[PDB]
Each structure stands twice: as C-alpha cells, then as structure tokens.
Amino acid sequence: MIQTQSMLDVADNSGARRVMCIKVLGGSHRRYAGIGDIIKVTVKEAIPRGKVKKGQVMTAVVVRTKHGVRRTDGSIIRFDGNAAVLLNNKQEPIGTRIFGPVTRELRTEKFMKIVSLAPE
Amino acid sequence: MKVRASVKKLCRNCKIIRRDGIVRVICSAEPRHKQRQG
Amino acid sequence: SRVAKNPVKLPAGVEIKLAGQQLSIKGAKGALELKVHPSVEVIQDSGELRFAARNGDQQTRAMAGTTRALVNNMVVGVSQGFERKLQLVGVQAKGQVLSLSLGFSHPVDYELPAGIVAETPSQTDILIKGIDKQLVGQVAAEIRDFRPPEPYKGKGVRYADEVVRRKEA
Amino acid sequence: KKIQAYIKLQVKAGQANPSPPVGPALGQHGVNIMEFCKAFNAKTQGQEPGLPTPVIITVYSDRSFTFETKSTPAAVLLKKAAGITSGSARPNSQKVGTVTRAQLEEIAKTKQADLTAADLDAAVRTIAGSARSMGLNVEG
RNA sequence: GAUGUCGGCUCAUCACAUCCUGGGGCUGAAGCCGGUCCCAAGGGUAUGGCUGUUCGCCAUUUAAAGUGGUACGCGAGCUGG
RNA sequence: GGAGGUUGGCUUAGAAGCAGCCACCCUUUAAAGAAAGCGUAAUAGCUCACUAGUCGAGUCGGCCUGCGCGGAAGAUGUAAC
C-alpha cells in the first residue's frame, strides 16, 4: 500500500481477499506508494477457486488509500480502507469487475480500464 | 586503441611515430593495428 | 634531396615583401598572407628565392624545410584557390552560411569565416575556395566532426579520395 | 588492361557453353565469360578433344584470346603415357609406378620446337619436367 | 606498572584498479543490445527471509546495488547476539 | 610495363599469387618467382625485385657504447630534490 509489510484489500474481481506489499516500485530508496502507484504484492488470503492463489508474488495498482490523494485546489479525498487491483505482466487488471470507488487520478492511459469498470 | 607495453610494425603499412612523448603506431590500412604506448 | 635546399622557382605574378625578420606576400586572387618568420632562418633572394638554416642543430633543419612548404602553398594560394570535393547526401547551400542535413532529427547549420567561401558545383558534392590551405582543410574537417563514414553502409560526408575501411556484418 | 602471366582457367575446348568446371570464372583480372567460343576454333581436331588438356591463357579486351603454342598435348597424355587417369596423391615421392623417357617417344614427334624450344631435341626435354607435375619422376 | 574482541548501529574520510551517469578507440560493432581497452572520482551507489555473523544463499527491486585504505576506520559514541 | 597451346589434377551456386596434403627453371630471342601474401570476404579493378633510354643525387641496414623515453596504478595534503 503505502509501504512494505502493509496489508491491503482487493478491489478487483477474482482471486485474493488480502494482499501484502512486499516492494514499492518506482525509484531506488522509494518508501511510499499512493493512489495510482505500482506495488509488488503477495497473496495472503484468497477465495477457493479464483484466478490467483495464496502465496503468489504479483503486481498491483494502488487505487484507494487512507492517506488519500490531494486535488489542485488543496482539497483531499480520503478513504476508509486500503485497496489495490491486481495486475498481470501487461499491467492490465486480471479481474473483470472493480468493487468500490476509485479516484480520477487513475483515469490515465494505462488504468482507465479500472476506471471504466468501477462504480465510482 | 591497443595500449600495450610493446608496440611494433604489425603490418608493412603499419608505421611507428613519436607524438609528444608517446610511441604510437599508425596503420594506414587497418585500424585494428593501431597502438598507443610502448 | 632535402626540401629547403632547392630554390623555390616562384612565378612572377606575386610581389613579395622582403623583411628578413618576417615575411609578407601579396598578389591578385587573394592577398594579406603575412607570416612571422622565426629566428633561425635566412632568406637569400634572386630572380627566385631559396631558404637556409643558420646553425647545425636538427631543430632548424625542420624549420627551414617547413617554411618553404608553408610559403609554397602561400604563393600557390594566391595563384590558385585551394579545393576539395566533399561528397555527401544532400546539400542546401545559401551563401556565407551553410545548411546541412546529416542523418539527424536536428538540421545543423555551419558558418564560413572571412576569406573562405562555399559553393555547390555538383548535385551533392561540396567544393571549396580559399587562399590558404591551412583554413581550406580546416573547414573540410569541421564538416566531418558532424558525421563519420559508416563502415557497414556509409552515410554522410566523405573525403575526396576513397580509403574508407568498409566492413560487412 | 593489366595482365600478369600464368593465369589459370578451367573451361572446355571448342564450345564456351559448359561452365561448372569453373562456373562463374571472371570478376577481377580479365575479360568476361561467354564469348570464348571462336578463339579455340581456328585450331581444332589435332589437339585431343574431350579429355583434360591444360592451358595458360592471356587476356585482351579487343576481341582476341591467344595462347602459348604447344601442338602436341603433353600433360595428360603423359598420364596416358604411363597408364593413369587419377594422379598420384603426393607429388614426386608417393608413386603409382614412374614413367621413363622411352614412353616419351610418340609425344616428342610433332610438337614443333620452333615456337616452344630451340631445336627439336631440346623440346624432348620439355616433358622431362612436365611429368614433374603428377607424382612421377622422368629418369630414362 | 593493560594498546579491552567479531558483527550490527551511528557517523564517516580518502584512494581509483569505475558499479551507475559523462567523453572516446577497436570489434568476429547491421540495428536493439554487447565484448574489450582507454579517459574520467562530480554526484549517486537497495530493501527484506535465514544465520551471532563478515560473507554467502535466496525473494523482490534499481540507472547502479563497485573494489580497497583508514588500529580488518569508529565501544572515555551505542549495542553485547 | 603485359606469352605465339589444349580444363596442370579424385571437387562440379563458387576451389590461383592465403583450404587438416606441397613446391627451383627448355622462346621468333636484349625479356623475367609452374610464387613469402592486404586485395571490388571470391572470381570482369590492384602492392616488395627491373640485364633498361628518361627527373639526379650521398644513401640503406646492423653492431659497440654515452645520456635520456614509454613500460609506471593508492589510499589525511603538494608528499621519493
């Protein structure tokens, strides 16, 4: 989520129920990841038959944090719960459904599939 | 370059010159046979 | 035979300024080519000229020789204009400023100093005109700092002769 | 055109059509391929058609290709003089059984020493070093 | 008639035999990448699972996770496995 | 500058003067390596010797010895007069 060992819910469709960040991607001593950032997860808990299994090093986009994300007027938007959407090596989502809201910082060229499925 | 301690005339168009203190070898045919110091 | 020990046999179209300490030359098709002559050099004059050393050390045996050849092409540079046929791909010439497109996504322009002048007598050749060979060869090396010849195919600017080491992959 | 002598060429006599004993023969020091068909054919049928009979050609770019006269074929009829068609595997030590000078008798008859030797007895010693080609020694 | 260990922590400082970034030569260098050798010390140069570890082996990073000297730098700075 | 015959070899898009294989002298007559190897990697362009008219000179290699030049990179600061 924000840092390593952080544990975070799963906002997309199939597989995991809880994932834990094992690496914040990006820079070198990079220590935090907010909404729109890419982390490296492992699947701590999953459903009985889904597209991911428990114990699996995967990549996920951070969609929904408690620290929140700030707008240009100074306003913040701040959620009750940490959540990510798991991705493949295309950095395309695996599930076909998104649960919960997302923010408009995520409707970029790579993550607008998550936005177009979300009930924002 | 080919920085060695032993520069020579590796071919017959290979020519040794002394250019401001350093014993260099030009080759007018093949740039592989060019050495700097020795 | 040594290069300064023979007389020059200069043409009679160029009037010299005999100085003894210096040397200045002038003619038609160019002028103003004065050269500050060094210490260890003698100038003996006649209907032709000849150069000489002063003392038995190998430094002025290299200096008396390099002075005759430096005023060989200083006579001939006022007689004739020095040339070179630089062959490349695409010349847009305009005048005292030169415009070129050598393989990049940036079209680099190049300037010609006073004296020298650039004209395009062919499609894609560059021919040059100047009164001293030191600056004529200088600006033909200033164009090749942009583009070296490729070994595998060969793009951009070349020399006039063909000694380009070509390589196949 | 620049020539240096002793130029090898492996082509058929009388007909410039069979190529693959040399195939594409000509790219760097001579004149091109298909038009040798007539220069051989002012001197025919006395010089062993069919079998190999080696050559030293000289090349011109003026529609002329003319050679080094020796009338009697005397390099592979030396293999016929002893009785071989495949030569010895190593020259002048490793043998098949060497040839002498009494099997040089028919060959030295009509070879016309005027343009290849001094007199007719000197042209007999031409093939005294031409079976010095094929793993044989000429002794007598 | 005492100069109190190994490692971690904290803080470093210098070297260049350069790990990254910068300039080049040659290539059995098409390009994308490389190989190798020069020049270059300005700034950068991981996080964890195991183990007391240095190292090492692994997981995931990074432009890169350099090699050495400094009482194998540093306990009247810490820890004390 | 340049030979007056007819594939000098078990090979067959492609096998000289450079492939695991080896080499010394016979002319219409003043004329010359059946070759030590960079070449348009290879074939249709081209380089060390001339028994020579013509440009006209002091040169080209080795040995002995004098003093020097590269080989020569390090950690607090020039820092081995």
Alpha-carbon gap: B4 to the closest alpha carbon of chain C (Å):
24
Q: Between vectors from CA D59 to CA D55 and to CA D63, what angle results, nearest 5°?
A: 115
Contacts of residue C165 in chain B, CB cutoff 8 Å? 29-31
CA D72 to CA D105: how far, in whole Å?
12
* Nucleotide closest in space to D27 (CA vs C1'): F44
**Residue D96 buriedness (CB in 10 A; 0-12 / 13-18 / 19+):** middle
- Read off the amino acid at residue C153: K
Report the CATH number at residue C72.
3.90.930.12
The answer to whether the Cβ–Cβ distance between B31 and C163 falls below 8 Å is no
CA D40 to CA D46: how far, in whole Å?
12
* Contact flag, residue D47 CB and nucleic strand F, below 7 A: yes
* Complete DSSP assignment for D42-109: GS-SSS-SSS-----B---SSS--------S--SSHHHHHHT-SS--SSTTSS-S----STTSTTTTS
CA C144 to CA C87: how far, in whole Å?
11
Domain tally for chain D?
2
Which of D20, D52, D69 is the last residue before a domain boundary? D69
Residue that the structure tokens 């076909």 belong to: A96
* Complete DSSP assignment for A11-68: -BSSSEEEEEEEEE-SSSS-----TT-EEEEEEEEE-SSSSS-SS-EEEEEEEE-SS-
Q: Which of residues 12 through 31 in chain B touch C, CB cutoff 8 A?
A: 28-31
- D62 and D74 belong to one structural domain: no
- D56 and D84 belong to one structural domain: no
Dihedral sign computed on CA atoms, order C116, C121, C126, C132:
negative
CA C123 to CA C109: how far, in whole Å?
18
CA C118 to CA C94: how far, in whole Å?
9
Q: Which domains does chain A have, with CATH numbers?
A: 1-120 (2.40.150.20)
Which of D41, D69, D97 is the last residue before a domain boundary? D69
- D37 and D52 belong to one structural domain: yes
CA C156 to CA C150: how far, in whole Å?
8
- D62 and D9 belong to one structural domain: yes
The CA–C1' separation of C97 and F36, in angstroms, is 55
Residue C103 near residue C41 (C-beta atoms within 8 A)? no
Which of D28, D44, D69 is the last residue before a domain boundary? D69
Domain encompassing residue C69: 14-79
Strand-pair partners of A98: A12
Dihedral sign computed on CA atoms, order D19, D23, D28, D29:
negative
Looking at residue C109, the DSSP 8-state letter turns out to be E
Instruction: Name the residue of chain C whose CA is nearest to B28's CA.
Output: C163
- D88 and D121 belong to one structural domain: yes
- D42 and D105 belong to one structural domain: no
- D4 and D58 belong to one structural domain: yes
- D51 and D84 belong to one structural domain: no
- D96 and D49 belong to one structural domain: no
- D3 and D54 belong to one structural domain: yes
Domain encompassing residue D130: 70-140
Helix and strand numbers, DSSP H then E, in chain C: 2, 11
Resolution (A): 2.9
